[PDB]
Amino acid sequence: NSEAAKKALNDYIWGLQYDKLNILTHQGEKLKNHSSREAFHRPGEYVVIEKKKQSISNATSKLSVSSANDDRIFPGALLKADQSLLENLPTLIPVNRGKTTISVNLPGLKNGESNLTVENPSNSTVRTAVNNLVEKWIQNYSKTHAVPARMQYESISAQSMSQLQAKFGADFSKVGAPLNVDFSSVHKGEKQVFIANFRQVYYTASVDSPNSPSALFGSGITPTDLINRGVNSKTPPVYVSNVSYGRAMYVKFETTSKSTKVQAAIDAVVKGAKLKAGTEYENILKNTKITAVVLGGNPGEASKVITGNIDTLKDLIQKGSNFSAQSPAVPISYTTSFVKDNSIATIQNNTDYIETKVTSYKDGALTLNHDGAFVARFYVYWEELGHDADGYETIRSRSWSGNGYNRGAHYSTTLRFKGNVRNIRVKVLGATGLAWEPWRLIYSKNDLPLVPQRNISTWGTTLHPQFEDKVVK
After folding, report:
1. 393 is in an annotated binding site
2. Is 145 known to sit in a ligand binding site?
3. Label partner for 5 (CA 20 to 30 A): which of 133, 288, 345, 363?
4. Do 390 and 288 share a structural domain?
């Protein structure tokens, strides 16, 4: 009678065949291979705006709550695994539901205080019940139990709107729009832009895995009811298994520096290494323009854009680092699981894009010192990137003017290289003052890095030739 209706639902859902870790895959642009560059001279450096084709392959289960999706996102909600979820605006399935057991992980809660049962789950019933649990928790436990955020952190180099959407979700186009990412500034090679998603999580409402597909729906629901509702193997059913509450922000970083490690620099701030002393990460973030849209803090803030420097961030991070407990926090991320096997669903976005790396190889110098009581002979070679009339890049093989002259005891000299030099090759020959062969490879080294200042010295005796290859920078 009832057993029969449930069973019929159970098998129908259990019956569905689909590629779990695949139907939730979005493909963006695909690009033809491409690798080009542009290099030029500017005092003290040779600059190279290099453009390559790259691909990003992003996989997430922790989906982000937005004002557009807000009303469909609540623990236990029935959605389809279709194009709408791929775009992060999932459609709820129009069907009577069954009891939903929900569990909130606020600390202090004991006995069955942490567990809720909602009769006819709707965005309304479930949110009321959840918040009412959170209102109880505040009055009773907030003064005695602290709630420090758990911080989810993702960041990336802004290259393309389509790449940002793979990393942050199709959503990102609108949610992030207030940040106005100037993509030409990256492509023109002037700026280096970054984007970070911060999710500061105070608490989560996790739904208990139901005893069977049947339990998610109302009594009297039928495989036919779901066939008609388009709940099938093309577009199988999922449920919101978790909803995380707190405060989240999207942040844009704008350097003019052309450094490598900016990402690791930003990563360093976030990650506990607060005020890194010395000199490296410090002297990069010093000149960074922080722009942040926040979500959770107040009601009416997806508006209020925040501007400042690296410090204006750390203060935004610390302001949300703990749960103030004035009132229930707002949803900021959720998870779906397939009804069939309760497995967390993963959204995957792949796309192709044009990366723009800007690089600077600075002027450097090479000091050769001979101090030994034997007859030395230096040999230095390298190549020189230039351009022709038509604009294409040229390679000129060059050698030192001092190649193979005999050097005496007090010798010294400095060859200065501009940034467009590469393949630096040093050979040194000392005299063994004998008949059958008179020179020996004292020191050879190919592909020498163009460091600001390198000393290659010599000394000792005709038997034991000494030498040192040291950087001074």
Report:
1. yes
2. no
3. 345
4. no
Range of the domain at 470: 363-473
Q: Could you give the CA distance from residue 160 to residue 176 in angstroms, rounded to a whole number?
A: 13
Cα gap 118→125, rounded to integer Å: 7
Within this chain, do residues 122 and 207 fall inside the same structural domain, yes or no? yes
Known binder of ligand: residue 387?
yes
One domain for residues 139 and 260: no
CATH number for the domain that contains residue 45? 3.30.1040.20
Residues 91 and 238 in one domain: yes
Give CA–CA dist 129/131, Å, rounded. 6
Give yes or no for a contact between 445 and 425, defined as CB atoms under 8 angstroms apart.
yes
What is the distance in angstroms between the CA of the first residue and the CA of the last residue of the chain?
84
Token code pair at residue 150 = 């758990």
Is 383 known to sit in a ligand binding site? Answer: no
Whole-angstrom CA distances from 124 to 80, 97, 129 are: 20, 13, 9
Resolution of the experimental structure, in angstroms:
2.6
CA dihedral of residues 79, 300, 205, 17 (deg, nearest 10): 20
Which 3 state secondary structure label does DSSP give 58? strand
How many folded domains does the chain comprise? 4
DSSP string for residues in 385-443:
EEE-TTS-EEEEEEE-TTTT--B-TT-EEEEEE-TTEEEEEEEEEEE---SS--EEEEE
User: Do both 208 and 184 map to the same domain?
Assistant: no
370 marked among binding-site residues = no
User: DSSP string spanning 133-168?
Assistant: HHHHHIIIIITTS--BPEEEEEEEE---HHHHHHHH
Domain at 256, CATH number? 3.40.30.40
Q: Work out whether strand 453-460 and strand 364-370 pair parallel, antiparallel, or are unpaired.
A: parallel
CATH of the domain at 414: 2.60.40.1430
**Taking a C-beta distance cutoff of 8 angstroms, is the pair 267, 285 a contact?**
no
Residues 163 and 109 in one domain: no
